[PDB]
From a paper:
Segmented negative strand RNA viruses of the arena-, bunya- and orthomyxovirus families uniquely carry out viral mRNA transcription by the cap-snatching mechanism. This involves cleavage of host mRNAs close to their capped 5′ end by an endonuclease (EN) domain located in the N-terminal region of the viral polymerase. The sNSV cap-snatching ENs belong to the PD-D/ExK superfamily of cation dependent nucleases. We find two different kinds of endonucleases, one with the characteristic catalytic histidine (His+) as in orthomyxovirus and bunyavirus, which have efficient endonuclease activity in isolation, and a second, without the histidine (His-) and conserved among arenaviruses which shows very poor activity in vitro.
To investigate the cause of the lack of activity of Lassa EN we structurally characterized the Mn2+ ion bound form by X-ray crystallography to see how it differs from the active ENs. Using a construct encompassing residues 1–174 from Lassa L protein we obtained three different crystal forms: one with no ions bound (crystal form X1), and two with one or two Mn2+ ions bound in the active site (crystal forms X2 and X3 respectively). Despite the presence of 2 mM MnCl2 in the crystallization buffer no anomalous scattering was detected in the active site. Compared with the X1 form, the X2 and X3 forms show a 17 degree rotation between the helical bundle lobe (residues 4–49 and 149–167) and residues 50–148, with the hinge being at the base of helix αb. The closure of the two lobes slightly changes the orientation of the active site residue E51. The previously reported Lassa EN structure in complex with Mg2+ ions has an open conformation of the two lobes, similar to the X1 apo-structure.
Author numbering: 0 to 170
Write the structure that this text describes.
Amino acid sequence: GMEEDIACVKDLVSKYLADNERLSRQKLAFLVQTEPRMLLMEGLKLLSLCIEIDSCNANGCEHNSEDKSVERILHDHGILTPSLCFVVPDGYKLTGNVLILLECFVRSSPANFEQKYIEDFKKLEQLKEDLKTVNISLIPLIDGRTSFYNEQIPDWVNDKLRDTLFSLLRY
């Protein structure tokens, strides 16, 4: 019933998720869930991951899979920093003293898109000023999207997945 619908949406994902090794852990995280809330959560994380991996691949950035702060990233490259505002980017790339940072987001309604853009922009611009004092040049990239569509699953499957996972909340 609920077991039947849960089995069905997993079946949907097994058929259609691209055969990409970088998705394997999170795909399995999704497939092992038996409760609707847990299933929803792991399904949204899978779609988020697909988007982040695409955005990083497009922009040549390392994907920030461990949610490292900027301070942590720089410290891992031997770079010490003053107190920075806390920022966890989706992707990064350090080349000498030039740091590229990438955020990506989804907002399907334009008013929200514009508000969130300003939100991410402000976080990133705070860093830029502060890194300048340690002669790190920040290159802030914002990849704002209007849907959850991505290269790892068909768009129609994407829609059906999200729809189903939220609905299951029926149980």
